[PDB]
Enzyme design. Structure first.
Site, PDB file in Angstrom:
ATOM      1  N   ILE A  32       0.735  -1.111  -0.018  1.00 10.13           N
ATOM      2  CA  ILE A  32       0.023   0.022  -0.063  1.00 10.13           C
ATOM      3  C   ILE A  32       0.849   1.242   0.155  1.00 10.13           C
ATOM      4  O   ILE A  32       0.409   2.407   0.327  1.00 10.13           O
ATOM      5  CB  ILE A  32      -0.862   0.046   1.078  1.00 10.13           C
ATOM      6  CG1 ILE A  32      -0.420   0.063   2.544  1.00 10.13           C
ATOM      7  CG2 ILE A  32      -2.043  -1.045   1.038  1.00 10.13           C
ATOM      8  CD1 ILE A  32      -1.333   0.158   3.698  1.00 10.13           C
ATOM      9  N   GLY A  33       2.329   1.032  -0.153  1.00 10.01           N
ATOM     10  CA  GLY A  33       2.962   2.308   0.033  1.00 10.01           C
ATOM     11  C   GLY A  33       4.680   1.854  -0.107  1.00 10.01           C
ATOM     12  O   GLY A  33       4.902   0.804   0.606  1.00 10.01           O
ATOM     13  N   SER A  36      11.380   5.923   1.542  1.00 10.86           N
ATOM     14  CA  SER A  36      12.910   5.751   1.638  1.00 10.86           C
ATOM     15  C   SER A  36      13.226   4.676   2.685  1.00 10.86           C
ATOM     16  O   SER A  36      14.190   3.870   2.586  1.00 10.86           O
ATOM     17  CB  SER A  36      13.338   7.104   2.036  1.00 10.86           C
ATOM     18  OG  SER A  36      12.767   7.933   2.871  1.00 10.86           O
ATOM     19  N   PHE A  37      12.562   4.584   3.957  1.00  8.92           N
ATOM     20  CA  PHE A  37      12.837   3.419   4.897  1.00  8.92           C
ATOM     21  C   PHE A  37      12.334   2.294   4.529  1.00  8.92           C
ATOM     22  O   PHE A  37      12.954   1.212   4.845  1.00  8.92           O
ATOM     23  CB  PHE A  37      11.722   3.737   6.164  1.00  8.92           C
ATOM     24  CG  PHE A  37      10.230   3.821   5.669  1.00  8.92           C
ATOM     25  CD1 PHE A  37       9.781   5.077   5.398  1.00  8.92           C
ATOM     26  CD2 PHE A  37       9.736   2.735   5.341  1.00  8.92           C
ATOM     27  CE1 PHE A  37       8.220   5.160   5.100  1.00  8.92           C
ATOM     28  CE2 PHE A  37       8.176   2.797   5.029  1.00  8.92           C
ATOM     29  CZ  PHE A  37       7.671   3.957   4.716  1.00  8.92           C
ATOM     30  N   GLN A  39       8.805  -0.230   2.906  1.00 12.10           N
ATOM     31  CA  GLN A  39       7.498  -0.343   2.393  1.00 12.10           C
ATOM     32  C   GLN A  39       6.376  -0.521   3.515  1.00 12.10           C
ATOM     33  O   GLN A  39       6.794  -0.922   4.429  1.00 12.10           O
ATOM     34  CB  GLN A  39       7.098  -1.400   1.469  1.00 12.10           C
ATOM     35  CG  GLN A  39       8.194  -1.600   0.289  1.00 12.10           C
ATOM     36  CD  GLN A  39       8.509  -3.086  -0.252  1.00 12.10           C
ATOM     37  OE1 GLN A  39       8.031  -3.244  -1.386  1.00 12.10           O
ATOM     38  NE2 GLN A  39       9.346  -3.905   0.401  1.00 12.10           N
ATOM     39  N   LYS A  55       4.992  -1.860   8.631  1.00 14.49           N
ATOM     40  CA  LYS A  55       5.882  -1.176   7.945  1.00 14.49           C
ATOM     41  C   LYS A  55       7.146  -2.065   7.881  1.00 14.49           C
ATOM     42  O   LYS A  55       7.621  -2.322   8.924  1.00 14.49           O
ATOM     43  CB  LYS A  55       5.916   0.202   8.540  1.00 14.49           C
ATOM     44  CG  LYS A  55       7.268   0.980   8.446  1.00 14.49           C
ATOM     45  CD  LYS A  55       6.988   2.586   8.884  1.00 14.49           C
ATOM     46  CE  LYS A  55       8.146   3.286   8.994  1.00 14.49           C
ATOM     47  NZ  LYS A  55       8.097   4.694   9.019  1.00 14.49           N
ATOM     48  N   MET A 107      -4.680  -0.346  11.205  1.00 13.04           N
ATOM     49  CA  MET A 107      -4.870   0.092   9.905  1.00 13.04           C
ATOM     50  C   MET A 107      -5.654   1.187   9.932  1.00 13.04           C
ATOM     51  O   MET A 107      -6.758   1.240  10.479  1.00 13.04           O
ATOM     52  CB  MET A 107      -5.574  -1.124   9.192  1.00 13.04           C
ATOM     53  CG  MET A 107      -5.811  -0.957   7.710  1.00 13.04           C
ATOM     54  SD  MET A 107      -4.495  -0.693   6.608  1.00 13.04           S
ATOM     55  CE  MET A 107      -4.937  -0.761   4.880  1.00 13.04           C
ATOM     56  N   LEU A 108      -5.075   2.437   9.229  1.00  8.47           N
ATOM     57  CA  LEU A 108      -5.874   3.479   9.245  1.00  8.47           C
ATOM     58  C   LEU A 108      -6.517   3.721   7.863  1.00  8.47           C
ATOM     59  O   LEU A 108      -6.237   2.990   7.056  1.00  8.47           O
ATOM     60  CB  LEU A 108      -5.098   4.804   9.716  1.00  8.47           C
ATOM     61  CG  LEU A 108      -4.400   4.549  11.086  1.00  8.47           C
ATOM     62  CD1 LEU A 108      -3.545   5.712  11.490  1.00  8.47           C
ATOM     63  CD2 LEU A 108      -5.783   4.746  12.045  1.00  8.47           C
ATOM     64  N   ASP A 154       8.292  16.783  10.954  1.00  8.10           N
ATOM     65  CA  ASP A 154       7.609  16.561   9.332  1.00  8.10           C
ATOM     66  C   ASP A 154       6.171  16.360   9.361  1.00  8.10           C
ATOM     67  O   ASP A 154       5.535  15.282   8.793  1.00  8.10           O
ATOM     68  CB  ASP A 154       8.264  15.409   8.706  1.00  8.10           C
ATOM     69  CG  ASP A 154       8.311  15.332   7.423  1.00  8.10           C
ATOM     70  OD1 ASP A 154       8.000  16.420   6.679  1.00  8.10           O
ATOM     71  OD2 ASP A 154       8.441  14.341   6.947  1.00  8.10           O
TER      72      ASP A 154
HETATM   73  C1  LIG Z   1       4.414   4.224   2.587  1.00 10.25           C
HETATM   74  C2  LIG Z   1       3.651   5.188   2.809  1.00 10.25           C
HETATM   75  C3  LIG Z   1       2.694   4.710   3.930  1.00 10.25           C
HETATM   76  C4  LIG Z   1       1.492   4.047   3.332  1.00 10.25           C
HETATM   77  C5  LIG Z   1       0.556   3.715   4.112  1.00 10.25           C
HETATM   78  C6  LIG Z   1       0.696   3.935   5.642  1.00 10.25           C
HETATM   79  C7  LIG Z   1       1.867   4.521   6.080  1.00 10.25           C
HETATM   80  C8  LIG Z   1       2.693   5.036   5.129  1.00 10.25           C
HETATM   81  C9  LIG Z   1       1.851   4.744   7.757  1.00 10.25           C
HETATM   82  C10 LIG Z   1       1.208   3.906   8.483  1.00 10.25           C
HETATM   83  C11 LIG Z   1       1.907   2.625   8.617  1.00 10.25           C
HETATM   84  C12 LIG Z   1       1.055   4.605  10.062  1.00 10.25           C
HETATM   85  C13 LIG Z   1      -0.279   3.242   7.874  1.00 10.25           C
HETATM   86  C14 LIG Z   1      -1.427   2.978   8.636  1.00 10.25           C
HETATM   87  N1  LIG Z   1      -1.359   2.814   9.875  1.00 10.25           N
HETATM   88  N2  LIG Z   1      -2.484   2.470   8.154  1.00 10.25           N
HETATM   89  C15 LIG Z   1      -2.619   2.795   6.572  1.00 10.25           C
HETATM   90  N3  LIG Z   1      -1.531   3.234   5.836  1.00 10.25           N
HETATM   91  C16 LIG Z   1      -0.339   3.438   6.617  1.00 10.25           C
HETATM   92  C17 LIG Z   1       4.030   6.489   2.398  1.00 10.25           C
HETATM   93  C18 LIG Z   1       2.762   7.494   2.519  1.00 10.25           C
HETATM   94  C19 LIG Z   1       3.281   8.640   1.628  1.00 10.25           C
HETATM   95  N4  LIG Z   1       4.630   9.208   1.856  1.00 10.25           N
HETATM   96  C20 LIG Z   1       5.771   8.130   1.682  1.00 10.25           C
HETATM   97  C21 LIG Z   1       5.508   7.033   2.595  1.00 10.25           C
END
Ligand SMILES: C=C(c1ccc2c(c1)CC(C)(C)c1c(N)ncnc1-2)C1CCNCC1
Length: 338
Positions: A32-33, A36-37, A39, A55, A107-108, A154
């Site tokens: 889903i994303g 740099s760190f 995925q 993460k 999951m948000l 940030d």
């Molecule tokens: C890879 C990214 C990223 C994608 C989804 C989520 C996060 C970061 C944060 C968390 C892990 C909190 C989270 C969550 N809890 N629920 C749902 N999606 C996320 C991106 C976003 C745009 N900028 C670069 C990084």
């Protein structure tokens, strides 16, 4: 050429396989994303019976160490007994799996930038802005807890997530530090960069409040308040709205001379923008003209008196002096919320 026994690509990232099962516990749904760190994947947790965000940190030392700092901060925040805690994304647990540090979060939903796109960049109402503002001031109050003293470093719309309700949570503590730890000069995303960081000056928790102010105006107008193409343009767009910064700040700033010159009478000025202080927030907000675009005329909660209270709160957030800039506890006292 083989990385991590075949599990990694050439970029230290774990190669995400849809439907893979880890440790007889996690079922990997999808990527889903990317950042740099590493995925972020969506996964189903069989023990807890819920969808989680995982993460996956890069299998590379530089990224592992950064994430160990991130884990230490989320675990510290977790140990705290308040309802303020839940405006931050909850780290459920962490594990190593195939030489990758994995952080498991609730999951948000999508972020505040996604929301703005879904407004076609016309912004959300003042009422929704106010609810967002209150949660965010509460989050920043929690981070300001003496035992935490976390500077986020940030804040921007894409680092504030919707849960699904207008409940919101701050995410991405990956650029974050504690007060008293040493200086990094190029921090914050450019549109949300405090003048002290622009000026190469020492900073504290107030840089978050500055970003917050920039954020709230953006959430209501649909667009960035200060959309700088580089650092010079950035400081200049700040100066358009807010004027020339206090002499006691500029007389002291290691980078004052990047943006400003001291004139023969000892005053400061810029080195074609609207004159200092002339692009009034009053107008950007449309205080008297029915809100931004004029799109909020006669809508409840959008009176001239409501807009003035909002304008007042923002200008306290956008104070050049980090010692005098509104602090979280008092931002919550403000009449915009009453
Ligand atoms: C890879 C990214 C990223 C994608 C989804 C989520 C996060 C970061 C944060 C968390 C892990 C909190 C989270 C969550 N809890 N629920 C749902 N999606 C996320 C991106 C976003 C745009 N900028 C670069 C990084």
């Amino acid at each position: 050429k083989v990385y991590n026994d075949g599990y990694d690509d050439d970029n230290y990232d774990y190669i995400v396989k849809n439907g893979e099962k880890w440790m007889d516990r996690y079922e990997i749904d999808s990527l889903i994303g990317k950042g740099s760190f590493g995925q972020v994947v969506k996964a189903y947790d069989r023990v807890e019976q819920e969808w989680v965000a995982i993460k996956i940190i890069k299998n590379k030392k530089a990224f592992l160490n950064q994430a160990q700092i991130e884990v230490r901060l989320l675990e510290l925040m977790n140990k705290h007994d308040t309802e303020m805690k839940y405006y931050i994304v909850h780290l459920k647990r962490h594990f190593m799996f195939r030489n990758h540090l994995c952080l498991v979060f609730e999951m948000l939903s999508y972020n505040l930038y996604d929301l703005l796109r879904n407004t076609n960049f016309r912004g959300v109402s003042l009422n929704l802005t106010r609810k967002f503002a209150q949660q965010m001031c509460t989050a920043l109050l929690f981070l300001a807890t003496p035992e935490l003293s976390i500077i986020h470093c940030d804040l921007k719309p894409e680092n504030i997530l919707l849960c699904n309700r207008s409940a919101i949570k701050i995410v991405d503590f990956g650029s974050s530090c504690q007060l008293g730890q040493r200086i990094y000069q190029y921090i914050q995303s450019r549109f949300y960069r405090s003048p002290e960081v622009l000026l190469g000056m020492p900073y504290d928790l107030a840089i978050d409040m500055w970003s917050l102010g920039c954020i709230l105006v953006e959430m209501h107008t649909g667009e960035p308040l200060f959309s700088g193409a580089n650092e010079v343009d950035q400081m200049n767009k700040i100066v358009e709205v807010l004027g020339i910064p206090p002499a006691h700040i500029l007389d002291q700033a290691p980078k004052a001379r990047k943006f400003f010159e001291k004139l023969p009478d000892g005053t400061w000025n810029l080195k074609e923008y609207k004159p200092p202080g002339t692009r009034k927030l009053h107008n950007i907000l449309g205080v008297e003209t029915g809100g931004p675009g004029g799109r909020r005329a006669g809508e409840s909660g959008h009176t001239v008196a409501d807009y003035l209270k909002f304008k007042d709160l923002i200008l306290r957030m956008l104070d050049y002096d980090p010692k005098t800039r509104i602090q979280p506890y008092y931002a919550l006292q403000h009449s915009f919320f009453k």
